[PDB]
Design a protein around this motif. Structure first.
Motif, short mmCIF file in Angstrom:
data_model
loop_
_atom_site.label_atom_id
_atom_site.label_comp_id
_atom_site.label_asym_id
_atom_site.label_seq_id
_atom_site.Cartn_x
_atom_site.Cartn_y
_atom_site.Cartn_z
N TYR A 5 31.14 15.37 -0.41
CA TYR A 5 31.60 15.04 0.95
C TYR A 5 32.69 15.78 1.44
CZ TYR A 5 28.30 11.20 0.93
OH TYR A 5 27.12 10.45 1.04
N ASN A 7 35.56 16.85 5.05
CA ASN A 7 35.97 16.83 6.20
C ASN A 7 35.85 17.62 7.43
OD1 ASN A 7 37.77 14.38 7.09
ND2 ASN A 7 39.33 15.87 7.92
N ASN A 38 33.43 12.63 8.44
CA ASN A 38 32.90 12.88 7.16
C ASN A 38 31.48 13.41 7.02
OD1 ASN A 38 33.06 12.60 4.44
ND2 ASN A 38 32.75 10.38 4.54
#
Ligand SMILES: *[C@@H]1O[C@H](CO)[C@@H](O)[C@H](O)[C@H]1NC(C)=O
Ligand SMILES: *[C@@H]1O[C@H](CO)[C@@H](O)[C@H](O)[C@H]1NC(C)=O
Ligand SMILES: *[C@@H]1O[C@H](CO)[C@@H](O)[C@H](O)[C@H]1NC(C)=O
Ligand SMILES: *[C@@H]1O[C@H](CO)[C@@H](O)[C@H](O)[C@H]1NC(C)=O
Ligand SMILES: *[C@@H]1O[C@H](CO)[C@@H](O)[C@H](O)[C@H]1NC(C)=O
Ligand SMILES: *[C@@H]1O[C@H](CO)[C@@H](O)[C@H](O)[C@H]1NC(C)=O
Ligand SMILES: *[C@@H]1O[C@H](CO)[C@@H](O)[C@H](O)[C@H]1NC(C)=O
Ligand SMILES: *[C@@H]1O[C@H](CO)[C@@H](O)[C@H](O)[C@H]1NC(C)=O
Lengths: 224, 366, 346, 50, 198
Positions: A5, A7, A38
């Motif tokens: 994950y 940004n 996200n």
């Protein structure tokens, strides 16, 4: 496949209309990828279908022709028409038929009653390629951009507006999403669009150089 | 403008001068084909409602007055455009949607409409530009024993989005026990027939419906009405017509860098500032022709009928019709003297006008 | 928030406090006088040289006649305000070529004849501090024709029928009136404001002014050099405060900002639909037949008319406020410059 | 109401200038009270002797 | 009990903002002005406060109006008694008469009545089939409800325009009165004024 994950880093801004505006601040409300979101990172060394949640931002920082094609639909194992885009070095074939997708659909480098078929110029051409897929009012809209990229670990900093590329009258139900991999190690970023309001800046040359959200932080609401 | 016959001493803003256009320009792209409306409106059979077919029309000259000769219809029902102006203006694509319905449910084909066909078979968007042609077809789409070649869908698990087809035939379930391909209890086939007969009433006749979906000028135009182009003239006040949009102004060469998907430039008042020529890849500004305000400086009508005219904010080269250039425009009919009196009629930035004896005449001064 | 410094004055029934020295203080008061005079063309704003819109607008009677009357009345009232504030002296007095006034240095407030616009140093600082909108009092149609860079806000203002009229008195004439008032005040005193100018030495004038406030006139004749030095230092401090701080002139900049913002809002209001299918009038006329285009054109006409009436109403309210400020400034010119005032904090 | 807000967005900037006018009046009221009452530099005190 | 008018105003988007200076700070400023006037005189309005006995300050005030200062020094007890009786009469007239403060009461009443009228204007149809927006939404399709909502939007916008214009005119009047009150504070309290009936 491996998941991570990361940004969004204020990426995923596209031209909302085919109108030239120069040196102005324009407020629009459309399906945009929110700032500092996200987004998820996939390393496909290995696979169910991804969701298509009101539009998809797609990013790929690799080279050559290892990445090509997409599958859109809602029941990919027949019994429902699905959208297929396949790429090569010469031609793009876009077909809306029922098809016979398996559990792991992929293209080897070395299908029913249907209507829509399309032949076009190649979608594809230190090389980050960004795509926006949208499905509004029976129309499938595809925006894209290619930019040089320094580091391939994360998405870069800055702005690069995505010019509109293909609008189609597909008119099907799209719920799930699948990526085709060419097999004779590919990583890609996936994010999801939301119906937000943006304030965009057109400079003296008519290019979008800056944009502000409207529900990220209270300062963005003040700037709205 | 004073609605009287005797005016007093002073300066009065009367009206505005404008430069009228001398020529007219029509610019349409050079296309020579004819749009195949003839093969759309006639067929041996149309399609069913759940499996309606859509035909793309592009890169051709569309004459909409020959549609009336192809089918006997009354209702040329249109929403965002008039039926009589479809030849004067141009689109980027036309989509023709063909299906055969019941006469009772023709009213469901409208923007913002619900029901059975409008919710489960064929849905129209709220911002629909484009229009509907429906005519009775009891001669070709009926049989005395019943017509079972046209199908419709009863109900669905969810409502149907605009311009969407769903042709799949799966047995509906409204409970807990699965159907498993068996139309037993709580399991029904989704598609059933109209069953047309000639003995039915006027609301239950078959109707053939063609929906022309027009998408407007956001792309380079491909479908155009029959009009003749004209040579492009620049640096003159003309009446242009670029791909169906009219206007009056002056066209000049442009320095704007249009991206190749862009063809229009828009100003902050949502008016067109730049345009792209549809024939040659050329960008042209649109600047309105010369204009301004006219003020009339007069003494009383009991003194004299002489007047002076002030053109506000313009040079004396720009005006088409003793000339002195002030900072409030320029003034015709009053001479400038190298003297200074108290102000009688205020003109502008330090300039006044008076009716003096040096024969009586109107003079201007600082 | 803190209201102020805490103090406790020592009151007794047999004790007094008497000053032994003094300071000469020069303060600055800034007062708006006039504003921008604007004129609006209704046909070019609502319709924009369209014949059908003009023919439908002719059925609305005399709304645009009375909006034009209100704007003309405001434009006349602005020049009346400037005339009643500044043009008050009867004759244009001049200062002598000798520049001795008892040691008092008026070099930064008297005009300098090197520049063409004969303004002083402080007047030049005040003019350079407040940036202007560069409005339509200078002609710009030749500049709006030549497409340099992008389209300006002022060009899009004037293309839609909004124009700025120049004031009657130029800045040279206002500077000449100010120089006449300054020369009369320095040379004659308060005598030129009640008749003919009677000359008097400046030291004797300041002795008369100290006799006006309750101080005996020998105090000036004993402390004249100290008082002149204090005046020169205060004038230099005023000059440095104008050269450094730029936020003291916020009232005139606020006037300029409001007058630009209202016109920008009036231009930006043209992009609205007001329930019609389009904001462009030609798209409505081309796409629709006569009755339906009449309906959409009527909706656009009503929306643009309401927006223009809102602009004229707020212009009238701001004109009333500016007129009150100009009446105060004319009273202050009459009672502070042409005489000596016994009113406290005036 | 969402549909009312969508139809209200077509009227432009009437709401913004109404809000601007009311904000100007609200600032002006505080300026009025400040220019009337806050005239003294320091908070003086009366001695306890009366 | 029942629904208040203030809750009906607040439930329709109308809010009353608090002033920046509370009544305690206004009373503190008034107390500072009174203390400076009583102790120093007019010297605190031109710089630092300079103490003086109140009898000698009042003799200065007598010399200001053209009466020789020995009149106060010979009738000081009578002058103090007359001042105390006049202050007590102001006390009694404020305790009995309630109609003297009608200007501030009218200022309160106008601002209450404008908001009450703006709330009551929400029950009007302006030509539509209903004043309720949800009834128009539920009882009609898209185009018909768009027409009726456009009618209601124009009516409510016009009523709010009228309210804002009335508030601007009343704000101009209140600003003129506040300028007069500031001048009377600077001239009557901080000094002795020679202007007649001022
Ligand atoms: C994104 O979502 C994952 C899901 O668990 C979470 O671990 C991660 O912290 C999120 N990233 C943020 C909030 O920046
Ligand atoms: C169509 O897509 C929607 C997602 O919005 C989903 O809920 C629905 O089940 C889909 N219908 C079919 C027949 O797949
Ligand atoms: C616009 O393009 C010109 C081309 O000469 C360039 O000089 C200018 O810097 C550009 N403006 C930008 C990048 O903001
Ligand atoms: C309908 O169009 C076809 C063209 O495919 C033509 O052959 C036929 O004669 C037409 N029929 C009528 C009744 O117009
Ligand atoms: C239309 O005109 C342009 C300009 O000369 C030309 O390049 C193009 O080939 C023409 N197209 C056709 C179909 O004649
Ligand atoms: C307009 O008038 C000004 C002032 O005389 C002059 O400088 C300018 O050259 C004129 N413009 C022309 C002749 O195009
Ligand atoms: C004057 O003040 C003193 C102390 O400050 C006090 O004792 C005296 O009583 C006062 N005079 C009168 C008349 O009260
Ligand atoms: C007055 O002031 C200026 C600058 O403040 C100075 O140059 C000039 O010498 C002064 N006059 C005299 C007589 O000193």
């Amino acid at each position: 496949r491996t998941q991570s994950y990361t940004n969004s880093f204020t990426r995923g801004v596209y031209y909302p209309d085919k109108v030239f505006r120069s040196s102005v601040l324009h407020s629009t409300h459309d399906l945009f990828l929110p700032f500092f979101s996200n987004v998820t990172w996939f390393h496909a060394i290995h696979n169910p279908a991804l969701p298509f949640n009101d539009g998809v931002y797609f990013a790929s920082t690799e080279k050559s022709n290892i990445i090509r094609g997409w599958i859109f639909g809602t029941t990919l194992d027949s019994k429902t028409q699905s959208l297929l885009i396949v790429n090569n070095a010469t031609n793009v074939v876009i077909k809306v038929c029922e098809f016979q997708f398996c559990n792991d659909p992929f293209l080897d480098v070395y299908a029913n009653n249907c209507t829509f078929e399309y032949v076009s110029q190649p979608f594809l051409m230190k090389n980050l390629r960004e795509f926006v897929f949208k499905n509004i009012d029976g129309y499938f809209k595809i925006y894209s951009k290619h930019t040089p990229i320094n580091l391939e670990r994360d998405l870069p900093q800055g702005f690069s507006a995505l010019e509109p590329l293909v609008d189609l009258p597909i008119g099907i139900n799209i719920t799930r999403f699948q990526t085709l991999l060419a097999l004779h190690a590919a990583a890609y970023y996936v994010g999801y669009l939301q119906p937000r309001t943006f304030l965009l800046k057109y400079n003296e040359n008519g290019t979008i150089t800056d944009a502000v959200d409207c529900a990220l932080d209270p300062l963005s609401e003040t700037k709205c | 403008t004073l609605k009287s016959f005797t005016v007093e001493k002073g300066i009065y803003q009367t009206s505005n001068f404008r430069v009228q256009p001398t020529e007219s320009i029509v610019r349409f792209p050079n296309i020579t084909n004819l749009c195949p409306f003839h093969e759309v409106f006639n067929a041996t059979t149309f399609a069913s409602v759940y499996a309606w077919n859509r035909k793309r029309i592009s890169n051709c000259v569309a004459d909409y007055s020959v549609i009336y000769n192809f089918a006997p219809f009354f209702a040329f029902k249109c929403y965002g455009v008039s039926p009589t102006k479809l030849n004067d203006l141009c689109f980027t694509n036309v989509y023709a949607d063909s299906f055969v319905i019941r006469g009772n449910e023709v009213s469901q084909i409208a923007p913002g409409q619900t029901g059975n066909i409008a919710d489960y078979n064929y849905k129209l968007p709220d911002d629909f530009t484009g229009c509907v042609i429906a005519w009775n077809s009891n001669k070709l789409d009926s049989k005395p024993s019943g017509n079972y070649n046209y199908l419709y869908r009863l109900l669905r698990k969810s409502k149907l989005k605009p311009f969407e087809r769903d042709i799949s035939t799966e047995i509906y379930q409204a409970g807990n026990k699965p159907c498993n391909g068996v139309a037993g209890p709580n399991c029904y086939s989704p598609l059933q027939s109209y069953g047309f007969r000639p003995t039915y009433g006027v609301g239950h006749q078959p109707y053939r419906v063609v929906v022309l979906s027009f998408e407007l000028l956001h792309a380079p135009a491909t479908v155009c009405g029959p009009k003749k182009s004209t040579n492009l003239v620049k640096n003159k006040c003309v009446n242009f017509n670029f791909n169906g949009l009219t206007g009056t102004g002056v066209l000049t060469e442009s320095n704007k860098k249009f991206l190749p998907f862009q063809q229009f430039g828009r100003d902050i008042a949502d008016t067109t500032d730049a345009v792209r020529d549809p024939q040659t890849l050329e960008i042209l500004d649109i600047t309105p022709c010369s204009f301004g305000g006219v003020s009339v400086i007069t003494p009383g009508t009991n003194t004299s009928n002489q007047v002076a005219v002030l053109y506000q904010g313009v040079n004396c080269t720009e005006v088409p019709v003793n000339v002195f250039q002030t900072r409030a425009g320029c003034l015709i009919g009053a001479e400038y003297v190298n003297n200074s009196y108290e102000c009688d009629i205020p003109i502008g930035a330090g300039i006044c006008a008076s009716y003096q004896t040096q024969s009586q005449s109107i003079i201007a001064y600082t | 928030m803190s209201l102020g410094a805490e103090n406790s004055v020592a009151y007794s029934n047999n004790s007094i406090a008497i000053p032994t020295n003094f300071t000469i203080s020069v303060t600055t008061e800034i007062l708006p006088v006039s504003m921008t005079k604007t004129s609006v063309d209704c046909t070019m704003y609502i319709c924009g040289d369209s014949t059908e819109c003009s023919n439908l607008l002719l059925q609305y009677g005399s709304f645009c006649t009375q909006l034009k009357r209100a704007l003309t009345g405001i434009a006349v009232e602005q020049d009346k305000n400037t005339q009643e504030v500044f043009a008050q002296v009867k004759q244009i007095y001049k200062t002598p070529p000798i520049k001795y006034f008892g040691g008092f240095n008026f070099s930064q407030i008297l005009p300098d004849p090197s520049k063409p616009s004969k303004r002083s140093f402080i007047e030049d600082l005040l003019f350079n501090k407040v940036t202007l909108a560069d409005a339509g009092f200078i002609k710009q149609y030749g500049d709006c024709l030549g497409d340099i860079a992008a389209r300006d806000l002022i060009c899009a203002q004037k293309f839609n029928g909004l124009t700025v009229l120049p004031p009657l008195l130029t800045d040279e004439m206002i500077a000449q009136y100010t120089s006449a008032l300054l020369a009369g005040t320095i040379t004659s005193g308060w005598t030129f404001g009640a008749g003919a100018a009677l000359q008097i030495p400046f030291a004797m004038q300041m002795a008369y002014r100290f006799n006006g406030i309750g101080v005996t006139q020998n105090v000036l004749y004993e402390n004249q050099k100290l008082i002149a030095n204090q005046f020169n230092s205060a004038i230099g401090k005023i000059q440095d405060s104008l050269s450094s701080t730029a936020s003291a002139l916020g009232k005139l900049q606020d006037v300029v900002n409001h007058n630009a913002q209202a016109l920008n809002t009036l231009v930006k209001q043209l992009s609205s639909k007001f329930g019609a299918i389009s904001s462009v009038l030609n798209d409505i006329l081309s796409r629709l037949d006569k009755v339906e285009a009449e309906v959409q054109i009527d909706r656009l006409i009503t929306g643009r008319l309401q927006s223009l009436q809102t602009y004229v109403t707020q212009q009238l309210i701001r004109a009333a406020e500016i007129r009150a400020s100009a009446n105060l400034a004319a009273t202050k010119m009459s009672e502070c410059v042409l005489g000596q005032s016994k009113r406290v904090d005036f």
